[PDB]
Amino acid sequence: FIGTASQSRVSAAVTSILTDGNAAATNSFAVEQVLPSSDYVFSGVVAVQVSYATTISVGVGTAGALTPVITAAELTAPVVVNAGTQLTVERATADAISKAATGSRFGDVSGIVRAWSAGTSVLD
Amino acid sequence: FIGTASQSRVSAAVTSILTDGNAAATNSFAVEQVLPSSDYVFSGVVAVQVSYATTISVGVGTAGALTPVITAAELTAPVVVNAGTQLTVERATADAISKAATGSRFGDVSGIVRAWSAGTSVLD
Amino acid sequence: FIGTASQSRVSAAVTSILTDGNAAATNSFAVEQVLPSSDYVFSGVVAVQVSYATTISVGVGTAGALTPVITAAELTAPVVVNAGTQLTVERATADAISKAATGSRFGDVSGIVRAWSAGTSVLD
Amino acid sequence: FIGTASQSRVSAAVTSILTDGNAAATNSFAVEQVLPSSDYVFSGVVAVQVSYATTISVGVGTAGALTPVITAAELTAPVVVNAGTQLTVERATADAISKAATGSRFGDVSGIVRAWSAGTSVLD
Amino acid sequence: FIGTASQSRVSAAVTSILTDGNAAATNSFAVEQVLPSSDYVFSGVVAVQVSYATTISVGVGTAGALTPVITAAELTAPVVVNAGTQLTVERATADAISKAATGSRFGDVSGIVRAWSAGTSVLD
Amino acid sequence: FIGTASQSRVSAAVTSILTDGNAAATNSFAVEQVLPSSDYVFSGVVAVQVSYATTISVGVGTAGALTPVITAAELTAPVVVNAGTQLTVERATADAISKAATGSRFGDVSGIVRAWSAGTSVLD
Amino acid sequence: FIGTASQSRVSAAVTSILTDGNAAATNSFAVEQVLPSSDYVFSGVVAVQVSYATTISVGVGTAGALTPVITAAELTAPVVVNAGTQLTVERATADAISKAATGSRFGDVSGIVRAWSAGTSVLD
Amino acid sequence: FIGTASQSRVSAAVTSILTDGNAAATNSFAVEQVLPSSDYVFSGVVAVQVSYATTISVGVGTAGALTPVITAAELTAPVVVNAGTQLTVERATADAISKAATGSRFGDVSGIVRAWSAGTSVLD
Amino acid sequence: FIGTASQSRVSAAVTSILTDGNAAATNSFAVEQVLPSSDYVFSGVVAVQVSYATTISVGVGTAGALTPVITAAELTAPVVVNAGTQLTVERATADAISKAATGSRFGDVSGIVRAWSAGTSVLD
Amino acid sequence: FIGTASQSRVSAAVTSILTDGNAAATNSFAVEQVLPSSDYVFSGVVAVQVSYATTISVGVGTAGALTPVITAAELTAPVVVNAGTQLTVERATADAISKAATGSRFGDVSGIVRAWSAGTSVLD
Amino acid sequence: FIGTASQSRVSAAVTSILTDGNAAATNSFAVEQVLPSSDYVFSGVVAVQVSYATTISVGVGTAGALTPVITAAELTAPVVVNAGTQLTVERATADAISKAATGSRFGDVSGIVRAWSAGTSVLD
Amino acid sequence: FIGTASQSRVSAAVTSILTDGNAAATNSFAVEQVLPSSDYVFSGVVAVQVSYATTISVGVGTAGALTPVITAAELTAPVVVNAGTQLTVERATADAISKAATGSRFGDVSGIVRAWSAGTSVLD
């Protein structure tokens, strides 16, 4: 759980404390997934499952107390292509470059790239 | 629960403490989802479900006390395309670039990009 | 409950402590939703519902004490497009850019963008 | 209840402690709503309702003690467009920009934006 | 009850403790409303009403003790446009900007905005 | 009762403890109103009224003990425009700005605003 | 009763404990008013009145014991414009600004405001 | 009774305990007034009066015991303009500013204000 | 857990504390994987498994207490080629270069590269 | 764990604290692997195994307490050739150079290299 | 552990703290290997082994307490030739130079080297 | 441990803290080796061994406490000729020079050296 500025992220945690008076067991599972937010997003059901074993003892051999532990954990986090249409200057500029390049007007592509990278023009 | 500055986010938590005097069980589930807020928002019913197992004991084999645990948890968080029409300078500038590019006026696209990136003009 | 500076946010919590003298159960549900406040707001009925199970025991098998738990929780938080008309400098500047762009006066768009981004002019 | 600096906000809480000597039940509901205060305000009747279930027991099956719980809660918080006319420098500047833009005097819009963003002028 | 520095705010609370020796009931309702104080104020009658149910028991079914609870609460807080005429520097500056803008003297608007934002002048 | 530094505020509270030996009832009502003190003040009669119901019992149905509760409370707090004439530097500066603006001497308005915001002058 | 540092404030409280051996009633009323002390003061008769009802019983219907309660309370606190003539530096500076502004010597107003806000001069 | 550091303040309290062996009544009235001490002082007769009602009973209707209560209380606290002539640095500085301003020597006013606010001079 | 700014990353941790009163064992496993986010993303089921040994004692030889430890741990993190189609200026420029190079128009490739790297043109 | 900006990296750690009341042992293993991310990535199962010895004592010879230690640790981190097809300007430029070089058009290679390194052309 | 910017690196550490109540021993081993990342990479099993001696005492001769120490440590870090095929401008330029040199076209080699080193041409 | 930018380097450290309650000994060994990375690399088993003496006392002659120290330490770091085949412009240029020199075409060697050192040609 370190990414505070991340834009597309799932975080989950499962914790437990089980006791019968004589024995106790504390278990936790934490997980985190992060995506490049301009390309993919999380959309769907987020799901966690854990698996507790009853084959671990603390004490004297097979006569020890039974203390359940987590030995397997899993996560679902559905990943979907980003499809938002709110406009940024960069996205519109890239779209204009693509439109110029589809017509083989590479001089216009060069002009736009010149204006973007250094703010110049053809006669400058 | 680390993203304080996030603009589109769902957070939820479920906690329980069950006891009968002789045995006790503490369980918790925390989850968080974050979206790129200029592209998607949360709109709909937020839903959480957890699953408690009755097959885990603490003590002596099958004769131990029954301590319920969480072994599955899930979240619904509906995701919807952002469709607000309040005006920003960036959104209007991108729209103007798109309008110029639809008419193959790539000189105007270049002029706007020059003014945005470095605040210059054609004769500068 | 981490977003102190958020402008459009719903927060809710439901807590309970039930006991009959011999057994006890503590349950809580906390949830939070956050929107990009320049685009959407919360307007309508905020509603929470929880679901308590009577199928979980603490003790000896089916003979254990009955301790209700929360296994499902939900939230309604109605989402509505922001439609306030109080004036900001950014909103008016974007509106002027849109007005210039509707008449294909991209030189005026470029001039406004130049003044906004670097505070310059055509002859500077 | 985390937003101390918020300007348009509703907060409410309902708490109860019910006992008959042998059984007890504690219940609480807390909720909070926050708006972008330059765009919307709260004006009208603030209303809360909760729903208590009589179908939950603690003890031995259907023979356990009856402990009421909250399973549904709701809030009304009326939302109204902000319509105050006390003057800020930003609001008047935006109004002047709008007046200039309605007459297609985009040079004056550019001049005001230049003075606002960097405090410059046309000959600077 | 978290906003100590708020300038326009209503706070109220209703509490009760009812007992007949064998059963007891404690109830409370707290509520708070906050406005943007430069735009609106509270002026009028502040009113609170609560609704107590007699349909909730603690004990054995319909034979349990009757413990009244709050299931509905409401608030009136009248909202009125701010109309004070004590002078601030910001309000007078905005008024001067509005006066200049009503005569299409956008150079004077630009001059005032330049002096406000950066403390400069036309020849600086 | 949280605003210690507030300059225009009304606070009131009504409390009661009624008993006949066998049954008892405790009731309280607290309320608070706060104004922007440079614009409005409290001047007039401050009035509180509460309403006690005789339709709530604790015990066995209609045979339970009668325990009065508060179900409605209200407040009067008269609000009046601030009209004090003791001089502050800010109020006099705003008045000078208004006097200059009434004669269309926007250069003097700009000069005063320059001196206030950054302590500069025309030739600086 | 929270404002310790307030300069113009009225505080009052009325308390009673009435008993006939078999029944008892405790009642209290507390109230507080606060003004902006540079603008208004309290001068005149401070007056409190309360209203006790004889229509509330604790016990069995109309046969219960009579326990008087407070159902209405009021306060007079006369408010008068502040008219003290002891000199502060701020008040004299504001008076000088007003004197300069009455003669349209806005350069002197600007000079005084420059010296107050940043301690500068015209040639600095 | 909360203002320990206040310089101009009146505090008073009246208490009584009346009994005839079978019935008893306890009554109290507390009040406090505070002024801005540089502007006004308390000088004159401080007077308190209370009003006891004989129309309130505890018991069985009109046959209950008579228990007097306070239903009206009042205070006189004479308010007089402060007229002390012991010298403070602030009062003398304000007087010098007033003397300079009466002769339209606003440069001297500016010089004194510069020395007070930041400890500077004209050539600094 | 050191990469806060990483865009494609999986983080997980499993912790346990087991005790029977006389002996105790604390175990933890932490793991992290990071990808070049423009090329690959994480999409699929994230899975963790650990293996606890019962062949380690603390004490006197084979007569010591049994303290389980982790001796093997594993992670699944599915890796998938990035396939988002949201437009960047760099991606569109590279696409235009590829289109020009597919037609052996290496002069246009050179022109675009010249505009990108230094913002120049053929006649500059 | 020092590489925060690395793009292709695996990090893992295993920790334990074992005690029987009289003796204790703390063990940890940390490991990290880093690749040149434009050439290789991590894809597959990440696996850790450790080996604990029971042949080390603290105390008096062979009669000392048994304290397990880690004497061997290992890691799997599968390494795979990078095969992402998202476009960079550098990758497309290199591809164009390769295409020109496959046809022995070394003048075009030289032209592209000239435009990349210094932004020049043949006649410059 | 000093190389943060290294692209091909292995880091590992083994730590232990062993005690029996009367004596204690702390041991650590840290190691790091770094390769020129354009030529070689790490691919395979990373392995660490340490050797603890039981022949060192602290105290009185052979009668001192036994404190195990590390006297030998080792690392495996498999080294493999870099074989990634993602394109850089430098790699493609070198490949073109090699292709020209295989055909004894040293004029083309010279031309490419001239364009790379100074961005010139044959007639410049 | 000072070379952060080194490309072929081995670093290792061994530390220990031994105590029996009355005497203590702290020992450390740190070592570092660095190679010219274009010529040689580290490939093989990295090995460290230390030697602890039992012939040093602190105290009164031969009756002092035994405090082990390190008196010999060693390192293995296998050194292997660099044999990577990823292409640099410098390596290809040197290879072309070698190819020309093997055929006694020293004019081509001179031409390549002229283009590398100053970017010139034969007729320049």
XYZ file of N, CA and C in Angstrom, chain D residues 3-66:
192
model
N -14.691 16.523 7.420
C -14.477 17.786 6.745
C -14.731 19.014 7.591
N -13.677 19.536 8.216
C -13.824 20.703 9.073
C -13.889 21.998 8.278
N -13.191 22.075 7.154
C -13.107 23.310 6.392
C -14.162 23.411 5.302
N -15.054 22.435 5.197
C -16.071 22.454 4.157
C -17.081 23.564 4.416
N -17.553 24.188 3.339
C -18.447 25.336 3.443
C -19.914 24.989 3.259
N -20.233 23.892 2.589
C -21.616 23.468 2.424
C -21.695 21.983 2.749
N -22.275 21.659 3.903
C -22.197 20.314 4.452
C -23.353 20.080 5.418
N -23.876 18.856 5.415
C -24.872 18.395 6.376
C -24.294 17.202 7.126
N -24.463 17.193 8.444
C -24.034 16.095 9.297
C -25.159 15.731 10.252
N -25.361 14.432 10.460
C -26.412 13.955 11.346
C -26.013 12.614 11.944
N -26.602 12.302 13.097
C -26.332 11.052 13.793
C -27.521 10.686 14.675
N -27.840 9.394 14.717
C -28.901 8.851 15.557
C -28.328 7.685 16.352
N -28.526 7.706 17.668
C -27.959 6.716 18.572
C -29.046 6.243 19.528
N -28.942 4.992 19.972
C -29.901 4.451 20.924
C -29.260 3.342 21.747
N -29.758 3.171 22.972
C -29.348 2.088 23.865
C -30.605 1.560 24.547
N -31.035 0.357 24.170
C -32.264 -0.247 24.669
C -31.945 -1.486 25.496
N -32.571 -1.600 26.666
C -32.340 -2.740 27.541
C -33.598 -3.048 28.341
N -33.777 -4.327 28.666
C -34.833 -4.766 29.569
C -34.279 -5.441 30.817
N -32.986 -5.295 31.088
C -32.374 -5.909 32.246
C -31.571 -7.149 31.921
N -32.097 -7.981 31.027
C -31.451 -9.226 30.636
C -30.761 -9.147 29.284
N -31.293 -8.362 28.354
C -30.708 -8.191 27.036
C -30.557 -6.704 26.753
N -29.631 -6.373 25.857
C -29.372 -4.987 25.501
C -29.010 -4.893 24.026
N -29.238 -3.710 23.456
C -28.916 -3.439 22.060
C -28.489 -1.987 21.914
N -27.334 -1.769 21.286
C -26.823 -0.437 20.985
C -26.749 -0.273 19.475
N -27.279 0.840 18.971
C -27.335 1.099 17.540
C -26.950 2.543 17.263
N -26.300 2.768 16.123
C -25.954 4.119 15.708
C -25.911 4.206 14.190
N -26.220 5.395 13.681
C -26.142 5.709 12.263
C -25.573 7.109 12.118
N -24.495 7.234 11.353
C -23.868 8.516 11.076
C -23.726 8.686 9.571
N -23.913 9.918 9.098
C -23.929 10.203 7.670
C -23.482 11.642 7.439
N -22.946 11.895 6.249
C -22.396 13.195 5.907
C -22.416 13.386 4.398
N -22.783 14.590 3.970
C -22.851 14.962 2.565
C -22.173 16.312 2.375
N -21.447 16.459 1.273
C -20.641 17.644 1.010
C -20.812 18.051 -0.449
N -20.964 19.352 -0.688
C -21.194 19.929 -2.002
C -20.101 20.929 -2.362
N -19.865 21.171 -3.665
C -19.017 22.308 -4.062
C -19.728 23.634 -3.826
N -19.276 24.387 -2.821
C -20.091 25.447 -2.235
C -20.290 26.652 -3.150
N -19.430 26.855 -4.142
C -19.637 27.931 -5.103
C -20.744 27.627 -6.100
N -21.219 26.391 -6.156
C -22.216 25.974 -7.131
C -23.555 25.608 -6.513
N -23.563 24.972 -5.341
C -24.795 24.503 -4.723
C -24.742 24.722 -3.217
N -25.927 24.796 -2.606
C -26.077 24.954 -1.162
C -27.190 24.034 -0.671
N -27.273 23.899 0.649
C -28.328 23.137 1.305
C -29.393 24.107 1.804
N -30.632 23.903 1.368
C -31.737 24.780 1.743
C -33.016 23.958 1.710
N -33.618 23.751 2.866
C -34.834 22.983 2.972
C -34.824 22.170 4.242
N -35.666 21.151 4.278
C -35.822 20.315 5.459
C -34.813 19.177 5.406
N -34.020 19.047 6.459
C -33.117 17.918 6.621
C -33.843 16.845 7.416
N -33.866 15.628 6.884
C -34.682 14.555 7.425
C -33.898 13.254 7.476
N -34.063 12.526 8.575
C -33.451 11.220 8.779
C -34.536 10.247 9.222
N -34.477 9.022 8.703
C -35.327 7.924 9.132
C -34.487 6.658 9.210
N -34.780 5.821 10.206
C -34.126 4.530 10.368
C -35.189 3.451 10.515
N -34.779 2.218 10.245
C -35.662 1.061 10.255
C -35.065 -0.012 11.157
N -35.816 -0.426 12.174
C -35.365 -1.420 13.144
C -36.056 -2.752 12.886
N -35.274 -3.824 12.829
C -35.789 -5.163 12.585
C -36.034 -5.885 13.902
N -37.095 -6.687 13.942
C -37.393 -7.515 15.101
C -37.178 -8.998 14.812
N -36.344 -9.319 13.820
C -36.148 -10.685 13.352
C -34.743 -11.214 13.628
N -34.024 -10.621 14.576
C -32.661 -11.023 14.902
C -32.604 -11.375 16.380
N -32.022 -12.529 16.691
C -31.904 -13.006 18.058
C -30.447 -13.287 18.390
N -30.141 -13.231 19.681
C -28.866 -13.683 20.221
C -29.177 -14.762 21.245
N -28.669 -15.968 21.016
C -28.902 -17.040 21.961
C -29.070 -18.406 21.337
N -30.164 -19.091 21.658
C -30.375 -20.443 21.160
C -31.501 -20.456 20.135
N -31.151 -20.277 18.865
C -32.119 -20.398 17.790
C -33.244 -19.393 17.899
N -34.458 -19.856 17.604
C -35.641 -19.020 17.743
C -35.974 -18.719 19.198
N -35.323 -19.385 20.144
C -35.554 -19.155 21.561
C -34.640 -18.093 22.154
N -33.803 -17.450 21.348
C -32.929 -16.417 21.857
C -33.655 -15.117 22.147
N -32.966 -14.238 22.863
C -33.506 -12.922 23.166
C -33.624 -12.080 21.900
N -34.621 -11.206 21.877
C -34.860 -10.336 20.733
C -34.068 -9.045 20.909
